[PDB]
Amino acid sequence: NKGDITGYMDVAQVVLYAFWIFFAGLIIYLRREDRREGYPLEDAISGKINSLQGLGSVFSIARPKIFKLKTGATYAAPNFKRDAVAIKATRTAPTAGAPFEPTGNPMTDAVGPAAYALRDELPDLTLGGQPAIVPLRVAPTFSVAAEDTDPRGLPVVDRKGAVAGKVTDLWIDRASIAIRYLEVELAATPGRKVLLPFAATRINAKTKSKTVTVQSILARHFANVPTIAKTDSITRREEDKVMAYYSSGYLYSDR
Amino acid sequence: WRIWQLFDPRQALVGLATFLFVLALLIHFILLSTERFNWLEGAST
Amino acid sequence: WRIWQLFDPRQALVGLATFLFVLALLIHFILLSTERFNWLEGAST
Amino acid sequence: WRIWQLFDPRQALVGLATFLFVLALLIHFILLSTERFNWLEGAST
Amino acid sequence: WRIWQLFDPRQALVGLATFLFVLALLIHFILLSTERFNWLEGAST
Amino acid sequence: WRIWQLFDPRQALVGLATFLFVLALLIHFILLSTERFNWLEGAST
Amino acid sequence: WRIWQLFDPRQALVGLATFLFVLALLIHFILLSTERFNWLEGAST
Amino acid sequence: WRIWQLFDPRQALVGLATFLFVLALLIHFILLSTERFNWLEGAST
Amino acid sequence: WRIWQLFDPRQALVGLATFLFVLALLIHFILLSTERFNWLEGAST
Amino acid sequence: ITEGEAKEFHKIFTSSILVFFGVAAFAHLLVWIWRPWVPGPNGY
Amino acid sequence: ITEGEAKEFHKIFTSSILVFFGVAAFAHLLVWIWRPWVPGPNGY
Amino acid sequence: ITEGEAKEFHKIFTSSILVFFGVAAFAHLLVWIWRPWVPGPNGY
Amino acid sequence: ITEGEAKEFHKIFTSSILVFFGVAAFAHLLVWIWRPWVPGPNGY
Amino acid sequence: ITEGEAKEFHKIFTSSILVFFGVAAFAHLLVWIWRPWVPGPNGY
Amino acid sequence: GPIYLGTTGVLSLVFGFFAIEIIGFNLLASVNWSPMEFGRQFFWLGLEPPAAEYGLGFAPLAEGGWWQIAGFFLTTSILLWWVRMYRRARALKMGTHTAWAFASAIFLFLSLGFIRPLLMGNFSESVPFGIFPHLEWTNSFSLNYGNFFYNPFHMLSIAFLYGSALLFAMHGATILAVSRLGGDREVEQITDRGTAAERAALFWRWTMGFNATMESIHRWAWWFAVLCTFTGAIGILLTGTVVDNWFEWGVKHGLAPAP
Amino acid sequence: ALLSFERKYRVRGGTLIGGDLFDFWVGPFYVGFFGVTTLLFTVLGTALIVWGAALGPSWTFWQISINPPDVSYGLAMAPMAKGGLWQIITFSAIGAFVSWALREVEICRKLGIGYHIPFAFGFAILAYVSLVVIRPVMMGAWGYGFPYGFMTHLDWVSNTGYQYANFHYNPAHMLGITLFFTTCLALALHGSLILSAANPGKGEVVKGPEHENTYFQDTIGYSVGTLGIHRVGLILALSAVVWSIICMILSGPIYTGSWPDWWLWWQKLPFWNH
Ligand code: 07D
Ligand code: 07D
Ligand code: 07D
Ligand SMILES: CC[C@H]1c2cc3[nH]c4c(c3C)C(=O)[C@H](C(=O)OC)c4c3nc(cc4[nH]c(cc(n2)[C@@H]1C)c(C(C)=O)c4C)[C@@H](C)[C@@H]3CCC(=O)OC/C=C(\C)CCC[C@H](C)CCC[C@H](C)CCCC(C)C
Ligand SMILES: CC[C@H]1c2cc3[nH]c4c(c3C)C(=O)[C@H](C(=O)OC)c4c3nc(cc4[nH]c(cc(n2)[C@@H]1C)c(C(C)=O)c4C)[C@@H](C)[C@@H]3CCC(=O)OC/C=C(\C)CCC[C@H](C)CCC[C@H](C)CCCC(C)C
Ligand SMILES: COC1=C(OC)C(=O)C(C/C=C(\C)CC/C=C(\C)CC/C=C(\C)CC/C=C(\C)CC/C=C(\C)CC/C=C(\C)CC/C=C(\C)CC/C=C(\C)CC/C=C(\C)CCC=C(C)C)=C(C)C1=O
Ligand SMILES: COC1=C(OC)C(=O)C(C/C=C(\C)CC/C=C(\C)CC/C=C(\C)CC/C=C(\C)CC/C=C(\C)CC/C=C(\C)CC/C=C(\C)CC/C=C(\C)CC/C=C(\C)CCC=C(C)C)=C(C)C1=O
Ligand SMILES: COC(C)(C)C/C=C/C(C)=C/C=C/C(C)=C/C=C/C(C)=C/C=C/C=C(C)/C=C/C=C(C)/C=C/C=C(C)/C=C/CC(C)(C)OC
Ligand SMILES: COC(C)(C)C/C=C/C(C)=C/C=C/C(C)=C/C=C/C(C)=C/C=C/C=C(C)/C=C/C=C(C)/C=C/C=C(C)/C=C/CC(C)(C)OC
Ligand SMILES: COC(C)(C)C/C=C/C(C)=C/C=C/C(C)=C/C=C/C(C)=C/C=C/C=C(C)/C=C/C=C(C)/C=C/C=C(C)/C=C/CC(C)(C)OC
Ligand SMILES: COC(C)(C)C/C=C/C(C)=C/C=C/C(C)=C/C=C/C(C)=C/C=C\C=C(C)\C=C\C=C(C)\C=C\C=C(C)\C=C\CC(C)(C)OC
Ligand SMILES: [Fe+3]
């Protein structure tokens, strides 16, 4: 009769059930926070707002929170900004769960792994307000570590051994110190330069040239890499477009 | 009739179905746990 | 009556219903844990 | 009445209701834990 | 008939199939666990 | 015959084959678990 | 009165309320722990 | 101004209040942990 | 005064006060942990 | 939506809930005839 | 959100809560008749 | 959802659910004839 | 929050809190009538 | 922050610390009258 | 490197340094100041808490007084470090989530060391300062109070520890998978949703039916990590104070068949 | 139902095996051939677990237990009423886990992202296999695998850890504990920093990598980075699991004695052996 509340109930059980109630409330709150992007759910075919939901739909979606940015703009979550229903692909079956088949070139049409989010047309900014990602020409202060090999001047090769071009510049990040993109001068159509993500490029170690191997896409796909408006800054949308185009190589390179 | 202008009928029906099924399952489990009302074991009165 | 201007009627109703159901379930389980008020076991008074 | 200029009435009422309910639940459970005021078991004085 | 105007027939059929199969399996297992209604061990009355 | 207008024939056939195979395996395992119907052990009636 | 120019009145009130409630709860729990001042048990002097 | 020229008034006040409260709580706990000065149990001299 | 041109007065004072307070607290605790010098639980010399 | 559809749904809902409650009441009456669940002063 | 809708909701809510409290009070009266929950000086 | 297709689905669903309920009722009747599941005052 | 809104909320809050405190006082008086919670010199 | 503000802060701080120390001294005197905390050669 | 201490950091460092010095000096004195024996028995050396007969008062220095002084100094240092990490976050105009997650670990530490002994009336069952001594305290605590496996809050703490490991193995793997799409810039993704966040959410949706966001996954991680130590502290507080045998509690509440 | 950004990613291809047959979604779940196999094994194993519960003495969820065959059976397959059910459930669970991992691989291929997530799940699968297959196989009997019960597997953990006097003294088990605690501490720190940067308080502007690095530099002395923290967390969780596997492989297959007694070598070192 030490911890007994009633004949069978006791303090440990009462605290356990209190924690169960709190944890159910916490799961509700965490799902509420989960539903701040991509919700409400739309119909697969028509695109209208329609889903199988219960009495908890009142509490499911929270009021939009406002993110205050250092540039003065505000971002709302959820923003309720949906993508276009029509895309450059057609379902293989009329069922809702059927997959999509690209109509033309998926890499250029930006569907599937080549798809990108319509981010703001504004470059990432550091604490001082200057663009975060700039080529090494615009940032003389930064330099590559002497223990590492400078990728500049190194040939760019694909998984099949075809040479795509040569590295002429490196794009760094001033906010979080790292190398983000490699500027490659294409062998075909000399003078044309394309951006190349650093995370998708591994160095081939002892090749007497340390060829920067790109396993994502082949050499012939470098000519179709999305372009950037400015020569010293890249917007978030262009950044996503480039990364999405490179990420689709594993699925659409041989097609 | 005014309540359905507050709550979506489909969401009300789905919530009612889930809640009623879970409540009935819980009450049946409690009855099975009890000795008097366990019709499967059929303990004497 | 201004409480319904302060609070969304839908959210207030769902919260109230959930609170009432959880409270009723808790009180029912508390009664079941008692020897006197356990109607399923029926201990003599 | 300027305390309602200091504090949002909706949040104040929600927090006050939560606090009062938790306090009442705690006091009731304490009374149940005591022997004299346990009305469910009803031990003699 | 308006129930199918409210709900998708294909989703309703799939959900009903899954739920009914799981319920029937659970009920059969519950019967198999009892002494009286276990038709595979055949305990006498 | 409209069930095929509702469900893709190949997907339905594959799913039904998987479900039937699982059911047959489960029932055979249950029979092996029982003593009367374990044909491999062959216990007396 | 300049202390209210130094400190935000809303923050001061919230912190005081929290601190005072916690202190009162702690003192009440201490009294409950003590044998002489446990009013719920009423140990004789 | 002798010592408030350097130290922030709000920070000094908050730190001093917190330190004094913590010291008082520690001294009271230490007194409660002794037989002679425990005013709650009140043992004889 | 030469010392105060090297050491910042604020940092020097803050460090010195912290060290002195910690030392005094440690010495008082050490005294309390001795039979002879414990004033709150005084014994014979 | 609109009070017309809302009242149609309310009519159907009322009929369905009345049928459900009637079935539940009949089941509870049969269960009570089988074994009542309210013990007396001496129990069951 | 408005005033007229809020007043309508308040009226319906008051009626519903009155019905709920009446049903709860009737149930509590039945439970008290069955077995009271306030012990006397000697307990139950 | 078109009314004609929904009504055709209902006219199929009613027949299917009635057949399912009839089969279940026949099985339950056979099970009750085998061993009823409602114990008496003395149990089984 | 405007001054009129704050004053109206204060009025309704005062009414509600006095109703709540009156109900709590009545409940505590009933509980004291049942069993007082202040022990005497010899305990309960 | 400024000279006048620092002067006001020093004045109010002096007043408050003097009140605090006076109350503490009164409490310590009362505690000493109740039970002294300096043991003698034989103890308490 | 550029570590900002401030007044609170100086205080915390001084208090913790005094506690560490006291503990180390006691450990070295336990082996009669032998460096060889100190190296030999370093794991087995410990500074034990005072016995039960001393209560919450000051035990003699050789009989737990040093433990009490070191424990109080360590507690003060840890609380001042909590204040430090609160004030650093406030100074950088950031949230205090780190301070309020450290608060859960501090709650567990106080429950093990101070709060439970305060409830029980003595420091006898407090955690001694030593590797193998505190491992043995863990073992003896579980053995004395039934089986800790049967503590439901110990169950929950283990579940949330496994959940923390599982959630970090999921989150790090997901961010590395979408690292080629800019997924490592998590706050930038939160502020402006990108294809990395979209693909992470879609992967988890297609895998297990539901997904999080780039901020809400960190909310999940924060709450799992906090709840681990919070539930554990609740279990420690309830152990012995209200439940003397966790195995018997489990038997009563259906966790185990009755012996 | 789809999200606001899912239609453009729901594309054909990416399957490892089965082709277009299983390239479709049922609600939010991607099905796949390995998903069909996952459903097969999950239904089989769950049905057999419920069957074992029915065969058992109680229907209490905590007390439901499927026990492995006796040690006397060795590695031979046992009758279904005497541990064969446990063996079938074990292998069905292994199949379900492998099929789940391969379904995750298919989803990664479809979305064009890395395989780090199935690679990390492979370590959980390996730990489970080591507990139910590798360790009992190198120990000589299926009876050393943990029973499939909410409480009986905890009883197995307790008994196995007390067979070696004190499991707290297992050197690899200490490293597993250290890495498990460090994974939770790092998860708390990472979630806290990300949430404090995204939510800098009401009326404040969202912070960035500069502030994130500066906060932890100022507080503790150093930082890791934006992707270094995720790599560190993944490596910490996987190393904790690997060292747990190592300690379990050492405890009974290799080392059979008392772990507290294993530590005498430290006290017997030549520079301290007096
Ligand atoms: C015989 C044993 C005995 C005994 C039976 C018994 C009882 C109890 N005692 Mg004790 N006590 C005993 C002895 C004894 N006792 C103390 C004192 C005290 C205190 C100190 C308060 C404090 O620390 O304030 C410390 C706080 C300060 C000084 C705050 C001042 C403000 C400052 C710097 C700046 C302002 C800025 C902020 C606050 C920040 C936020 C901003 C805004 C709110 C705007 C006090 C109010 C108090 C309360 C009780 C309790 C709760 C009990 C219970 C329930 O047992 N006790 C006396 C003191 O210090 O009076 C000033 C003192 O000297 C003395 C003695 C000898
Ligand atoms: C016989 C032994 C036994 C047993 C058979 C068994 C079983 C298992 N259990 Mg258990 N357990 C046993 C006993 C037992 N169990 C623990 C606890 C747990 C935890 C710890 C969580 C944590 O993060 O701790 C870790 C957090 C702490 C302790 C607090 C953080 C500390 C802080 C901030 C202080 C900062 C420090 C400094 C500034 C440095 C100061 C310097 C100096 C002193 C020199 C947890 C999750 C957990 C795991 C497992 C598993 C997985 C198993 C398996 C597989 O067998 N157990 C209890 C608790 O409440 O944990 C919160 C607790 O106290 C306690 C006891 C006595
Ligand atoms: C005498 C008792 C005693 C004792 C004193 C003591 C102490 C402590 N120990 Mg230890 N331990 C004891 C017993 C003992 N100890 C363990 C193990 C460990 C681990 C491994 C954790 C892990 O990596 O799990 C890794 C987890 C696995 C196995 C992952 C497998 C999971 C998979 C594939 C997925 C399954 C998915 C489904 C089924 C689908 C779900 C479906 C839906 C939700 C819809 C570890 C780090 C750990 C923790 C602690 C701590 C912190 C303490 C404290 C607080 O003192 N102990 C060993 C193990 O399992 O190693 C793999 C093991 O077997 C064993 C034994 C016998
Ligand atoms: C959510 C639960 C998890 C958790 C979380 C957690 N821990 C945390 C935090 C969080 C969120 C922090 O923010 C905080 C931190 O800073 O982490 C980096 C911390 C922390 N938890 C820590 C460890 C830790 N966490 C653990 C675990 C956990 N904490 C859980 C798994 C564990 C265990 C047992 O598993 C440990 C051991 C610390 C690293 C850190 C808190 C640091 C602290 O409090 O330090 C106090 C200060 C000192 C001891 C001072 C030492 C001084 C030295 C002697 C140097 C010399 C100074 C100088 C010379 C002195 C002056 C001399 C003169 C006076 C002569
Ligand atoms: C290796 C690092 C950590 C880790 C990582 C990890 N786990 C993962 C993943 C990753 C990266 C996934 O992607 C995957 C996932 O999708 O999670 C949501 C998953 C997952 N790990 C999970 C759980 C889990 N992980 C754990 C641990 C860990 N996994 C490590 C700490 C633990 C424990 C004990 O600590 C558990 C319980 C699931 C949430 C999920 C596995 C999904 C899965 O396997 O789906 C297919 C199977 C089913 C739906 C059901 C199969 C049922 C069987 C037929 C029966 C099995 C019975 C069983 C053997 C015993 C049951 C009784 C017990 C009480 C003993
Ligand atoms: C970058 O930040 C990141 C985010 O993102 C922005 C995140 O989100 C997350 C993800 C993290 C979270 C979302 C937070 C929450 C996560 C946790 C707390 C971890 C713990 C997870 C759980 C507790 C959930 C576990 C649930 C599971 C495992 C899902 C279970 C699924 C199944 C059992 C079925 C799987 C689906 C299949 C195989 C097909 C679909 C099945 C059905 C729909 C039902 C059956 C269907 C039919 C009957 C019709 C079809 C049938 C067929 C084909 C025939 C089959 C035959 C049979 C009958 C067998 C992370 C990590 C991340 O870092
Ligand atoms: C978005 O991304 C984000 C960042 O990026 C922008 C981040 O940055 C971080 C922050 C994360 C990190 C910086 C590292 C996270 C990784 C881990 C937690 C695993 C690695 C574990 C450690 C190295 C422990 C680090 C903890 C520290 C430094 C706490 C600091 C506490 C004090 C200064 C107080 C006094 C210190 C004491 C009492 C001990 C503190 C602990 C240690 C210093 C390590 C233990 C050391 C010993 C006790 C003995 C060993 C002595 C050593 C090491 C010196 C001698 C040399 C040897 C090798 C022996 C996050 C979360 C993040 O989300
Ligand atoms: C828009 O619509 C169109 C135009 C298309 C027309 C379509 C109309 C259609 C298709 C309408 C469908 C209507 C239907 C199907 C209506 C069904 C209504 C039903 C069945 C309603 C049922 C309501 C039941 C309620 C609200 C019951 C509540 C019970 C409660 C809360 C009991 C709780 C018990 C407790 C807490 C205690 C339990 C005791 C134990 C022992 C468990 O405690 C431990
Ligand atoms: C720029 O300058 C201007 C012009 C502004 C002028 C400024 C002037 C200033 C700021 C002047 C300040 C001067 C001060 C404060 C000077 C203070 C000097 C002091 C106090 C010096 C003391 C030195 C002490 C020394 C070097 C002691 C050394 C002792 C040692 C190494 C002993 C070691 C013992 C061992 C190892 C033995 C231990 C035995 C045990 C038992 C402990 O071993 C286990
Ligand atoms: C800018 O200003 C404007 C213009 C806005 C005007 C505003 C003015 C304001 C807001 C003025 C506010 C003034 C106030 C409220 C002042 C409050 C002053 C107080 C309460 C001062 C009190 C100070 C107390 C001190 C300094 C006490 C120090 C005691 C110490 C360090 C004792 C330590 C004892 C030890 C280490 C020994 C302990 C013994 C054992 C270990 C046994 O105890 C546990
Ligand atoms: C230069 O000098 C060096 C650094 C070489 C000295 C060497 C130092 C060393 C080697 C230090 C470390 C040694 C070891 C092996 C430490 C290991 C520590 C471990 C693993 C500790 C684990 C757990 C301990 C816990 C959880 C204890 C917590 C205790 C608490 C919270 C106690 C609080 C006590 C209080 C608040 C006391 C209150 C009573 C008062 C004092 C107020 O009145 C009686
Ligand atoms: Fe996001």
3-state DSSP call for residue F42? coil
Cα pseudo-dihedral P75, P81, P87, P93, rounded to 10: -170
Tell me if F28 sits within 8 A of E40, measured CB to CB.
no
Count of CA atoms in the C-beta half-sphere (13 A) of O239: 31
Q: How far is the CA of O21 from the centre of ligand 2 (A)?
A: 24
- C13 to chain B: which residues are within 8 Å by CB? 6
Q: How far is the CA of L25 from the centre of ligand 3 (A)?
A: 49
User: Which protein residue has the closest C-alpha to ligand 2 atom 48?
Assistant: O158
Exposure b/e, F7-27, CB count within 10 A at least 16 = b: bbeebeebbeeeeeebeebbe
- Contact partners, residue L26, CB within 8 Å, separation at least 6: none
C36 touches chain B (CB under 8 A): no
Q: Looking up tokens 């003078």, which residue turns up?
A: A191
How far apart (Å, rounded) are the C-alpha atoms in residues J25 and J12? 20
- Contact partners, residue A128, CB within 8 Å, separation at least 6: none
Tell me if A247 sits within 8 A of O182, measured CB to CB.
no
The preferred substitution site among J16, J19, J23, J37 for testing ligand 8, maximizing ligand atoms within 8 Å of CB, is J16
Q: How far is CA P57 from the centre of its chain?
A: 30
CB neighbour class for F43 (10 Å; exposed up to 12, middle 13-18, buried from 19): exposed
Residue A237: how many other CB atoms lie within 10 Å: 18
Tell me if O119 sits within 8 A of O237, measured CB to CB.
yes
- M44 to chain G: which residues are within 8 Å by CB? 42
Residue O195: how many other CB atoms lie within 10 Å: 33
What is the position in ligand 3's atom list of the atom closest to the CA of P180? Answer: 46
In one-letter notation, the amino acid at residue P223 is: S
Tell me if P89 sits within 8 A of P49, measured CB to CB.
yes
Where would I find the H helices in O42-151?
65-91, 97-110, 116-120, 131-144
How far apart (Å, rounded) are the C-alpha atoms in residues E1 and O118? 68
- K38 to chain D: which residues are within 8 Å by CB? 39
Rounded to a whole number, what is the distance in Å from the CA of A67 to chain C's nearest CA? 24
In one-letter notation, the amino acid at residue A255 is: R
Rg value, chain L, Cα:
18
Instruction: Give the helix/strand (H/E) hosting A193.
Output: strand A193-197
Rg value, chain P, Cα:
24
H44 touches chain O (CB under 8 A): no
The preferred substitution site among O20, O153, O154 for testing ligand 2, maximizing ligand atoms within 8 Å of CB, is O154
Q: Is the CB of E5 under 6 A from ligand 8?
A: yes
Q: How far is CA E7 from the centre of its chain?
A: 22
Measuring CA to CA, how many Å separate A33 from each of A60, A65, O218?
9, 10, 10
- Contact partners, residue P200, CB within 8 Å, separation at least 6: O93, O94, O95, P206, P207
Q: Which of K37, A2, D35 is nearest to G40 (CA)?
A: D35
Inter-residue long-range contacts of C11-20, CB under 8 Å, 24+ positions, other chains counted = C11/A58, C11/A59, C13/B6, C14/A55, C14/A56, C14/A58, C14/A59, C15/A59
Q: What angle do CA D8, D9, D10 make, to 5 degrees?
A: 95
- Contact partners, residue K16, CB within 8 Å, separation at least 6: none
How far apart (Å, rounded) are the C-alpha atoms in residues J21 and A160? 73
For O198: left if phi > 0, alpha if psi spans -120 to 50, otherwise beta; the answer is: alpha
3-state DSSP call for residue A101? strand
How far apart (Å, rounded) are the C-alpha atoms in residues O94 and A62? 23
Q: Which of A69, A61, A63, A115 is nearest to A88 (CA)?
A: A115
Rounded to a whole number, what is the distance in Å from the CA of G13 to chain D's nearest CA? 10
Residues of chain A with a CB closer than 8 angstroms to some CB in chain O? 2-3, 8, 10-13, 15-16, 19, 23, 26, 30-31, 33-34, 36-38, 67, 69, 75, 77, 115-117, 119-120, 124, 176, 197, 199-200, 236, 239-240, 243-244, 246-247
3-state DSSP call for residue A131? strand
How far apart (Å, rounded) are the C-alpha atoms in residues A26 and A30? 6
How far apart (Å, rounded) are the C-alpha atoms in residues O155 and O150? 7
- Contact partners, residue B14, CB within 8 Å, separation at least 6: A52, A53, A54, A55
Q: Which of I27, B6, P42 is nearest to C11 (CA)?
A: B6
How far apart (Å, rounded) are the C-alpha atoms in residues D39 and K44? 10
Tell me if P95 sits within 8 A of P37, measured CB to CB.
yes
User: Chains C vs B: touching, with 3+ CB pairs under 8 Å?
Assistant: yes
Tell me if P171 sits within 8 A of P165, measured CB to CB.
no
Q: Which of A112, A111, A99 is nearest to P109 (CA)?
A: A112
By Cβ distance, the residue of O14, O60, O66 closest to I35 is O60
- O44 token code pair: 């087995």
CB contact under 8 A, M10 and D1: yes
How far apart (Å, rounded) are the C-alpha atoms in residues P67 and L44? 32
- E15 token code pair: 């959900």
Tell me if O110 sits within 8 A of O237, measured CB to CB.
no
Cα pseudo-dihedral C30, C33, C39, C40, rounded to 10: 130
Residue I34: how many other CB atoms lie within 10 Å: 12
Instruction: Give the helix/strand (H/E) hosting O153.
Output: helix O152-177
Q: Which DSSP letter does residue A227 get?
A: P
Whether the CA torsion C34, C39, C40, C41 is positive or negative: it is: positive
In one-letter notation, the amino acid at residue O204 is: W
- The experimental method, as deposited, was cryo-EM
Residues of chain I with a CB closer than 8 angstroms to some CB in chain N? 39-40, 42-45
- A84 token code pair: 């276009």
CB neighbour class for O11 (10 Å; exposed up to 12, middle 13-18, buried from 19): buried
Q: Which DSSP letter does residue A87 get?
A: -
How far apart (Å, rounded) are the C-alpha atoms in residues B29 and B42? 15
- D31 to chain G: which residues are within 8 Å by CB? 40
User: Which protein residue has the closest C-alpha to ligand 1 atom 11?
Assistant: H28
- F43 token code pair: 């216990």
User: Chains L vs E: touching, with 3+ CB pairs under 8 Å?
Assistant: yes
CB contact under 8 A, A30 and O211: no
How far apart (Å, rounded) are the C-alpha atoms in residues K14 and K6? 12
Q: Terminus-to-terminus CA distance in chain B, angstroms?
A: 47
Closest alpha carbon within chain E to L20: E20
Rg value, chain D, Cα:
17
- Contact partners, residue K38, CB within 8 Å, separation at least 6: D39, M34
User: Which protein residue has the closest C-alpha to ligand 11 atom 15?
Assistant: O130
Residue P190: how many other CB atoms lie within 10 Å: 24
Q: How far is CA P32 from the centre of its chain?
A: 23
H33 touches chain O (CB under 8 A): yes
How far apart (Å, rounded) are the C-alpha atoms in residues L32 and M7? 71
In one-letter notation, the amino acid at residue K31 is: V
Counted residue by residue, chain N has a size of 44
Which of H16, H28, H31, H40 to mutate against chain G (most G CBs within 10 Å)? H40
Q: How far is the CA of E43 from the centre of ligand 6 (A)?
A: 42
Tell me if O236 sits within 8 A of O109, measured CB to CB.
no
Tell me if P144 sits within 8 A of P252, measured CB to CB.
yes
User: Which protein residue has the closest C-alpha to ligand 10 atom 23?
Assistant: N17
Tell me if P96 sits within 8 A of P125, measured CB to CB.
no
Q: Which of A68, A183, A184, A180 is nearest to A123 (CA)?
A: A180
- Contact partners, residue K2, CB within 8 Å, separation at least 6: none
G20 touches chain D (CB under 8 A): no
- D15 to chain G: which residues are within 8 Å by CB? none
By Cβ distance, the residue of A7, A17, A56 closest to C34 is A7
By Cβ distance, the residue of M6, M13, M35 closest to D5 is M6
In one-letter notation, the amino acid at residue A117 is: A
In one-letter notation, the amino acid at residue P252 is: G
- Contact partners, residue A108, CB within 8 Å, separation at least 6: A114, A224
- Contact partners, residue O228, CB within 8 Å, separation at least 6: O104, O157, O160, O161, O163, O164, P184
How far apart (Å, rounded) are the C-alpha atoms in residues O223 and O226? 5
Tell me if A226 sits within 8 A of A241, measured CB to CB.
yes
In one-letter notation, the amino acid at residue O233 is: A
CB neighbour class for J31 (10 Å; exposed up to 12, middle 13-18, buried from 19): middle
Q: Which of P123, P132, P121 is nearest to P34 (CA)?
A: P121
Measuring CA to CA, how many Å separate A188 from each of A184, A194, A230, L34, N44?
11, 12, 22, 86, 101
How far apart (Å, rounded) are the C-alpha atoms in residues A14 and A24? 15
Residue L13: how many other CB atoms lie within 10 Å: 17
How far apart (Å, rounded) are the C-alpha atoms in residues I33 and I26? 10
How far apart (Å, rounded) are the C-alpha atoms in residues P36 and B23? 32
- P174 token code pair: 């200490």
How far apart (Å, rounded) are the C-alpha atoms in residues L25 and L5? 30
Q: Which DSSP letter does residue D20 get?
A: H
User: Which protein residue has the closest C-alpha to ligand 5 atom 39?
Assistant: O166
In one-letter notation, the amino acid at residue N23 is: V
The dihedrals phi and psi of B25, each to the nearest 5 degrees, come to -60, -45
How far apart (Å, rounded) are the C-alpha atoms in residues J10 and J15? 8
CB contact under 8 A, P53 and E33: yes
Q: How far is the CA of I36 from the centre of ligand 11 (A)?
A: 26
Q: Which DSSP letter does residue E42 get?
A: T
Question: Is G35 within any annotated ligand binding site?
Answer: no
The dihedrals phi and psi of P26, each to the nearest 5 degrees, come to -115, 105
How far apart (Å, rounded) are the C-alpha atoms in residues H26 and H16? 15
Q: Looking up tokens 């000096």, which residue turns up?
A: O25
Q: How far is the CA of P29 from the centre of ligand 6 (A)?
A: 6
Q: How far is CA O159 from the centre of its chain?
A: 15
I10 touches chain H (CB under 8 A): yes
3-state DSSP call for residue A147? coil
CB neighbour class for O57 (10 Å; exposed up to 12, middle 13-18, buried from 19): buried
Whether the CA torsion O168, O170, O176, O178 is positive or negative: it is: negative
Closest ligand to the CA of P157: 3
| One-letter-per-residue 3-state SS of P55-120 | HCCCCCCCCCEECCCCHHHCCCCCCHHHCHHHHHHHHHHHHHHHHHHHHHHHHHHHHCCCCHHHHH
- E16 token code pair: 């009903």
CB contact under 8 A, K38 and D39: yes
Bridge partners (DSSP) of residue L40 are L43
Bridge partners (DSSP) of residue A101 are A90
- A178 token code pair: 């790292």
Tell me if P144 sits within 8 A of P157, measured CB to CB.
no
Measuring CA to CA, how many Å separate A184 from each of A187, A214, A217, A237?
9, 12, 14, 20
For P261: left if phi > 0, alpha if psi spans -120 to 50, otherwise beta; the answer is: alpha
How far apart (Å, rounded) are the C-alpha atoms in residues A216 and A193? 18
- C22 to chain A: which residues are within 8 Å by CB? 21
Q: Which DSSP letter does residue P12 get?
A: S
How far apart (Å, rounded) are the C-alpha atoms in residues P109 and P77? 38
Closest alpha carbon within chain O to P110: O203
For N27: left if phi > 0, alpha if psi spans -120 to 50, otherwise beta; the answer is: alpha
| One-letter-per-residue 3-state SS of A34-79 | HCCCCCCCECCCCCCECCCCCCCHHHHCCCCEEEECCCCCEEEECC
Q: Which of O166, O210, O203, O167 is nearest to P124 (CA)?
A: O166
Which of G7, G16, G40 to mutate against chain D (most D CBs within 10 Å)? G40
- G26 token code pair: 């702690």
For A196: left if phi > 0, alpha if psi spans -120 to 50, otherwise beta; the answer is: beta
Residue ranges of K 11-40 with Cβ closer than 8 A to chain C: 13, 35, 37
- I4 token code pair: 């105060």
* Longest distance between any two alpha carbons in chain L, whole Å: 58
User: Which protein residue has the closest C-alpha to ligand 11 atom 10?
Assistant: O24
Q: What angle do CA P32, P36, P42 make, to 5 degrees?
A: 135
How far apart (Å, rounded) are the C-alpha atoms in residues P274 and P272? 6
Bridge partners (DSSP) of residue A68 are A74
Instruction: Give the helix/strand (H/E) hosting O231.
Output: helix O216-238
Bridge partners (DSSP) of residue A166 are A155, A185
Whether the CA torsion A42, A47, A49, A51 is positive or negative: it is: negative
